[PDB]
From a paper:
M1.HpyAVI is a DNA adenine MTase that belongs to the type II R-M system. M1.HpyAVI encoded by ORF hp0050 is an N6-adenine methyltransferase belonging to the β-class MTase. It has been reported recently that this enzyme recognizes the sequence of 5′-GAGG-3′, 5′-GGAG-3′ or 5′-GAAG-3′ and methylates adenines in these sequences. The structural basis and the catalytic mechanism underlying such a distinct activity are not well understood due to the lack of an available 3D structure of this enzyme.Here, we report the crystal structure of M1.HpyAVI from H. pylori 26695, which is the first determined N6-adenine MTase structure in H. pylori.
The cofactor-free and AdoMet-bound proteins were crystallized at different conditions. Both structures were determined by means of molecular replacement, and refined to 3.0 Å and 3.1 Å, respectively. Four and eight protein monomers resided in the asymmetric units of the two crystal structures. The two structures are very similar to each other and could be well overlaid with an RMSD of 0.76 Å on 191 Cα atoms. Some amino acids, particularly those within two loops (residues 32-61 and 152-172) in both structures, were poorly defined in electron density and had to be omitted from the refined models. The overall architecture of M1.HpyAVI revealed in these structures resembles the AdoMet-dependent MTase fold in which a twisted seven-stranded β-sheet flanked by six α-helices forms the structural core. In agreement, a dimer of M1.HpyAVI was observed in our crystal structures with the two monomers related by a two-fold axis. An area of ~1900 Å2 was buried at the dimeric interface, taking up ca 17% of the total area. Another difference locates at the highly flexible loop between β4 and αD (residues 33-58) of M1.HpyAVI, which was invisible in our structures but present in the structures of M.MboIIA and M.RsrI. Collectively, M1.HpyAVI possesses a long disordered TRD, which is in sharp contrast to the secondary structure-rich TRD in other β-class N6 adenine or N4 cytosine MTases or the extra DNA binding domain present in DNA MTases from other subgroups.
Numbering used by the authors:
A (entry chain A): 1 to 33, 58 to 159, 171 to 232
B (entry chain C): 1 to 31, 62 to 113, 115 to 156, 172 to 231
C (entry chain B): 1 to 31, 59 to 115, 117 to 153, 155, 173 to 231
D (entry chain D): 1 to 31, 61 to 110, 118 to 146, 148, 150 to 155, 172 to 231
């Protein structure tokens, strides 16, 4: 099942309250990254998650401490952080500074939740991909995140879905996606990648 | 030159003000925001800091630094090949962090090898080799490196092998004399 | 009609969505963070012509008012009342005698108001008497008032004396049974 | 001593840094409006305070901002003075002191609401309270004056700034010059 909306996440959320919607996991990459604003989508969307559900939020090292504390204020337990590295950076300036090859994501679960994890064998580390693509997002990255923290019929929610790619990953993994995007061009891009019409 | 102290970093620091001390780089792994503000005045105009931290803090420490006249340039990380608690419900934590910040108008060091870039100096078999690479990068041979919490040393030992002139402080008696043995009398 | 619950306002709210509850006025004094978040969740329950009256602090009220205006409410005004027996300086400081409340209405609403025989406004009082006048003003006789934090009651009691059909929630069991007895069981 | 300037508070402030100026209390009613605080805070002496007239749609922000700049927010003071809404009787002011300050306060014979009916009496009573006889009072936006005039009558050594010339010459006349 794939269902996407063209809307403002801070408005359709009220409609989700009326429908008493339940989703298994929110896997998203929020905008930006008073800090409330916007940690606030978290406080607003946190009630949708099932007792055993989790969250995965992509972010910047200048924020993650704030996001994590906020999550644990809203009824989640932060288990760990995951990362993925790009092999071809911008660079940009290599004689005065490090290249930023690395992006981060936060992983938190509901408080008394029995969470998924789900671990192919092997036994496994903190960084899903060495990836390729230079300069988002790679389908392969999202597929491995979604392969890990969700199971086949669990409901995945991406309040900012952008191009899709969270939804596309869920589809290939047969995971029942719901997603939201504000701007029409990205919405139409996600909608075409996901067929429908 | 190597000089170590057995003391509380939050008290002997005042003695440093009286001595009008200046240091080139502070490289440490503290055992939390406020020591930065008190040890920041010791830093030279072109100096930097490298502070080991946790992902639950690193965002705070970065912001606190930028309030005190430093610019957070980047973060570095290094991985252990040997951690394991329950691997079936969770990731193993292989990854450790440090924050890299420089003085505001500083002309900082960097100093890359023939090698190139990235964000991650080492994997493993804390480690002297790691500290050796941090100090090799962010300091020059005669600069003064300060470690307000030096623990075992190894910031000091790395500095000694690289001929970089260490100063350090340790509160707990066991670790200090361990550090005192590792360098020399 | 009076209905009270022993529960957490941040959970039972979903039950209010299932029941499609609609309320005319929310008049409450919450016990920072979550002080803004209940607004966004409880706001949809208010009828097109309804209002809110929120007790708050001068250290907050600018936030709450502005938050109200992003959520489909219009901040109309603030009201205040004075306490005759405050306590902490007094030799170094003002006595804190004054408490505030926020008054907001739904955006396109034709709101209640409803002033008595004489003239003018803004400082109701010198408690039941306070709430009776607030409720006498901003609601009409058969309208529905909701107090997600009712504490001792007294928001409900004012509604009962004024025949205004109260709903209220209280988390702490001691205060709830206080309100439950104060009304009846 | 009374000293007034006709200028913009957001640049002449730099001249005040050059003169190494220090003022004991800033008492003002500004016409964004948070940052003048950040620039004018260093001028305040260790035991000094600030009194800022503001709106309840702001008062919480200004307070938080004051406490970001090295002041501690003590309290607010207020004074008086459509059929469908309340009449607006109330104006606010924020009162803050420097952090480790031993501040003024200075209450009468004795005990938040100074007046029942800017009035010179209001400002005179504020200044009678939060300053002492020779302390230096600064009003970066002084408008019509009346902060300077209270300070003159109470012998408090005023400094003030106004951008618009109409109010300035009115303030200049009231202070003689």
């Amino acid at each position: 099942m794939i269902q996407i909306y063209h809307a403002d996440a801070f408005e359709i959320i009220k409609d989700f309250y009326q429908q008493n919607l339940k989703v298994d996991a929110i896997i998203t990459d929020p905008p930006y990254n008073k800090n409330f604003k916007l940690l606030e989508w978290i406080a607003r969307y946190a009630p949708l998650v099932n007792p055993n559900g989790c969250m995965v939020i992509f972010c910047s090292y200048r924020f993650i401490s704030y996001i994590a504390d906020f999550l644990e204020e809203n009824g989640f337990v932060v288990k760990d952080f995951i990362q993925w590295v790009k092999n071809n950076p911008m660079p940009r300036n290599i004689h005065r500074r490090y290249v930023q090859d690395t992006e981060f994501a936060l992983w938190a679960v509901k408080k008394k939740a029995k969470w998924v994890f789900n671990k192919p064998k092997n036994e496994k580390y903190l960084r899903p991909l060495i990836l390729k693509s230079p300069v988002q997002k790679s389908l392969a990255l999202m597929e491995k995140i979604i392969s890990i923290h969700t199971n086949p019929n669990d409901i995945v929610l991406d309040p900012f879905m952008g191009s899709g790619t969270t939804g596309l990953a869920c589809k290939n993994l047969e995971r029942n996606f719901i997603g939201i995007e504000s701007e029409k061009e990205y919405f139409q891009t996600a909608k075409k990648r996901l067929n429908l019409f």
